[PDB]
């Protein structure tokens, strides 16, 4: 039984596009068409607005929390073509960086695993993906993947730092081989996997099963599984689960999870990679879980009552 634990009045003046909890589940960031990002302390069924972040000139599409080892850092991306990096210092939030290297709307932002440092992926309607890296010394470094998707990139999601199975087959003295990978979805109906090799980003895999724009992509957290899992959703109303049992074979198998009667906007994994949330154009959020036979079942249809 899923129960509503808390209801947050965000006091946004226009449509909310994203809502992200911090790593500890004690802060909520929200972003809106009102061009603001709001941050709430969420404790014991209360909320307190702690920041109203202003710096975008258009609708803010996505927010993403960095890993807490780097402090309280938030990325935001917007229709205004900006990516903004916000940081809290001494209880005050400030704009620490602004990236304007995209020619169109920046639709998605995702932080890399903390093993890689402060690295942010940014997907844009200019069809490019930018990778922003902060080394601690000097300006943010930028690697731009031009023509990542035709027409536009809608979503980006980082792979886990450690390959599935690499902790089971290691005799006691080799460091885990950390491979920088992320997945993207675009307006060319493709899901694409990117890999860093020799300091360059290459298209590692091209995943073909959607018949219209890929709206969102989510790489599942690898908690002790030997398999890599990706979810994708599309304007075609389909949700696919992509699985790869061997990181060497580069073989990805699509499984249709469901076909909705309307557009599917978002897919999000639980931190334990055992539940997938799916958000449709029908104003519903559905929760999906894999059964022991590998079958996906809907375990909650949260009707927005009121």
């Amino acid at each position: 039984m899923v129960s509503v634990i808390n209801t947050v009045d965000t006091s946004h003046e226009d449509m909310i596009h994203d809502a992200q909890m911090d790593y500890y589940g004690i802060r909520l960031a929200t972003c809106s068409s009102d061009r603001s990002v709001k941050i709430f302390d969420v404790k014991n069924g209360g909320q307190i607005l702690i920041a109203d972040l202003r710096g975008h000139d258009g609708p803010v599409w996505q927010v993403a929390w960095a890993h807490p080892m780097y402090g309280n850092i938030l990325a935001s991306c917007s229709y205004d073509r900006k990516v903004i990096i916000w940081k809290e210092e001494n209880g005050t939030w400030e704009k620490t960086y602004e990236y304007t290297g995209h020619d169109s709307s920046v639709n998605s932002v995702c932080w890399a695993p903390h093993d890689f440092g402060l690295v942010l992926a940014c997907g844009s309607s200019d069809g490019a993906i930018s990778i922003l890296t902060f080394t601690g010394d000097g300006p943010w470094e930028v690697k731009k993947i031009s023509n990542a998707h035709t027409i536009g990139c809608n979503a980006v999601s980082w792979a886990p730092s450690v390959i599935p199975g690499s902790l089971v087959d290691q005799p006691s003295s080799q460091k885990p081989n950390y491979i920088k990978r992320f997945v993207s979805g675009g307006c060319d109906n493709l899901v694409k996997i990117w890999r860093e090799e020799d300091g360059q980003w290459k298209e590692d895999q091209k995943l073909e099963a959607h018949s219209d724009w890929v709206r969102d992509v989510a790489w599942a957290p690898s908690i002790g599984l030997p398999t890599s899992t990706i979810a994708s959703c599309s304007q075609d109303g389909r949700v696919y689960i992509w699985t790869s049992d061997d990181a060497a074979t580069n073989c990805w198998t699509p499984k249709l999870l469901h076909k909705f009667n309307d557009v599917v906007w978002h897919v999000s994994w639980s931190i334990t990679a055992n539940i997938l949330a799916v958000s449709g154009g029908d104003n519903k959020v559905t929760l999906w879980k894999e059964s022991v036979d590998g079958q996906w079942a809907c375990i909650s249809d949260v009707n927005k009552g009121q």
């Binding site: 039984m1 969420v42 199975g165 002790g224 999000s268 994994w269 990679a273 949330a277 929760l287 927005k304």
Partner: protein
Amino acid sequence: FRVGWGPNWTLVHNGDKLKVHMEKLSLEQKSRELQSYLMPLEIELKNSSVDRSAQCPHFKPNAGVAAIHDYAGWVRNLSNEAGELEAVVKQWGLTWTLCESLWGQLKELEASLDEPNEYVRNLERRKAFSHWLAHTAEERIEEEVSLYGPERHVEAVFSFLTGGRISDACRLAQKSGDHRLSLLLSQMVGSQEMRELISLQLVDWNKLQVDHYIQEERLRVFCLLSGTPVWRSSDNRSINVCSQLDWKRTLAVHLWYMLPPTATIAQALRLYERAFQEHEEGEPYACYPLPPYLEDCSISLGDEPSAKFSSLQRDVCVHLLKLYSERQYDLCQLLDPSSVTPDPLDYRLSWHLWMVLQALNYTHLSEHRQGTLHASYAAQLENVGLWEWAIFVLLHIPHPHIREAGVRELLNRQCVVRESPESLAKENFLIHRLCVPAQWVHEAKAIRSRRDGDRHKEALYLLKGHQWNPCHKLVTRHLAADAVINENYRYLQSFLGELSNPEHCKHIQDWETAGKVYLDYIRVIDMLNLIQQDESSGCELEKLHTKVMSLCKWVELIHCYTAKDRLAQSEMAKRVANILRVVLSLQQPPESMSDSSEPRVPLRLLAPHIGRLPMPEDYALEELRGLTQSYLRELICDS
């Protein structure tokens, strides 16, 4: 924004409520449920071994059947100690007592000094399983017999026969005045000839069309005693013996009446499976083995049954009976929560069954499904607030890197920086019982202290966590300047003193240019305070002089990032120059007492070091004015 699960089953999504939505999925928590989690986990912790060969501890279940008896003993004690057991714990009782009947130690097999022949093992297992079936039907038979009263004594006799209680069926028949039925029932123990005679009697009643004058309930008793599951009366009425029976009593009737006393559990199961499958030779006469939360669901089997049974989950007990009969039976269906509970997120029984099946040497569960069981049950324990036991569940993951990642991830979420007696009890459980490295607990507390902005506690936990490089960078950049400005040298010495160990210093980047300079500065202050309190020997004054002269060179090389660091560097420079003057004044022999001149500080030794110290312009000008006035006084006294 990324859709995903946060801690304590917090779903963050952009879809309709089941704009960013944050929804907390709570299993309904009654406060009596915590003991239902802890006791099974303590049984598994007693019945597991810790491999310490790797940096991440690995728990494995101990090979054998001891865990099965500890679980079966636990559920028996719970059934004896209180009214209103959770219906779920009654179902676990059936499951664990079945596991004990199938795989557990039998006292009858231990009483023989010789290795018991496979036939004797199969016979004693069949008896143990027969006793299990009889006990599972006891509550329901007593309810049924209480309902039938004295007028429906034949239905109450039938109910006792379907529980294997032939003696009580005989006594009831005798008390009701049915002496013919009582005599018949007294002869049923061990005679196959009697079964064949009753079968002939049924055939003769049907041929003579006398069966239509006999009560249906009475014919049903004769059908059961003959070992015929379905009888067609001369009136074309079908008498089904299994029509009013649950799947457990139906399987028991197949074991006791339909099969010979030498028949195996696997033969009884296969005969029962054919009884509810559609075959060319007859209509299904047995119920399908549904889980107990579906047994009362009137699933109207409307006119197409073959496509619906492939979608209907079986009771976990039937999956265990299949696994016992067929060693390669699919564990994925057996360990699915839907075989036990209406809640698909309840991995309690499934996870403990997997540990026991692994102890029995079942290994054919895929690594992906093992990972799902460990992750799902650990997430359930995290949501209930038993996250220390969620670590224990994750320590069973075979793969070392996945295990280590999952344990550190859970520590980073749930480790509290505030020392409560409960938090310290959980930490002691992890370090002393689970053998988790204390370093990882301190690393998680350091990361949490960083989030909370507590730089002191961050430095303390990085030190305890053996993270020397991060600790040194934090102390030098953020604690050293504030400690120097506030004259809190003992506080800076506690961190820099521990970092100064010769085994730790080799691993520290830039130790000599930053961390050592602050430590050597504190040591120079401490030695000066000692020299002011004891009338000190000239050897300690020469050691102080050599250290002060070295510090004058190294204070310049301190990297200043903040205005506070420059202030601390300037205060250190001012203090070190004053110390150098005092030391040079005290190194003089007392043989130049001409009354009326201040102590003659030798300017040639002082001037090269004052000009290299990063002093504020105003103080550097005062020092240069003092040096020029004293140099003018040296020139006026040498003329």
